Design a protein around this ligand. Structure first.
Ligand SMILES: *[C@@H]1O[C@H](CO)[C@@H](O[C@@H]2O[C@H](CO)[C@@H](O)[C@H](O)[C@H]2NC(C)=O)[C@H](O)[C@H]1NC(C)=O
Ligand SMILES: *[C@@H]1O[C@H](CO)[C@@H](O)[C@H](O)[C@H]1NC(C)=O
Lengths: 36, 49
């Protein structure tokens, strides 16, 4: 049961300024009070 | 030896709060200076003798 919808509305998507997010812990190791 | 990490040192109980995904900690010289114990989940400082 897999019925598609005709009700698709086309509009070009907005852009947004991602300031300083999306940092993640780069490896499975602990470090502290340091610049790396 | 912890998990194959051979070394000579003095072990001590630590207040370095390793997050759940971590297993080892390291110094500015790229060497392991703390390690959570694989049997009982506490963090140990490693200091050279
Ligand atoms: C649901 O609609 C899509 C289109 O939105 C159908 O995909 C088309 O399938 C035909 C062949 O049947 C192709 O010639 C078109 O190029 C396809 N269009 C797109 C945009 O993919 C799909 O077959 C439909 N399915 C059902 C079950 O209705
Ligand atoms: C080792 O395993 C036994 C049984 O599997 C368990 O009772 C014991 O708590 C384990 N050791 C530790 C430190 O949890």
């Amino acid at each position: 049961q897999c019925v598609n919808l005709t009700t698709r509305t086309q509009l070009p998507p907005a852009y947004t300024n991602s300031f300083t997010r999306g940092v993640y812990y780069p490896d499975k190791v602990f470090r502290s009070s340091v610049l790396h | 030896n912890f998990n194959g990490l051979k070394g000579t040192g003095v072990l001590t109980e630590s207040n370095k709060k390793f997050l759940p995904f971590q297993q080892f900690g390291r110094d500015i010289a790229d060497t392991t200076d703390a390690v959570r114990d694989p049997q009982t989940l506490e963090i140990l400082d490693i200091t050279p003798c």
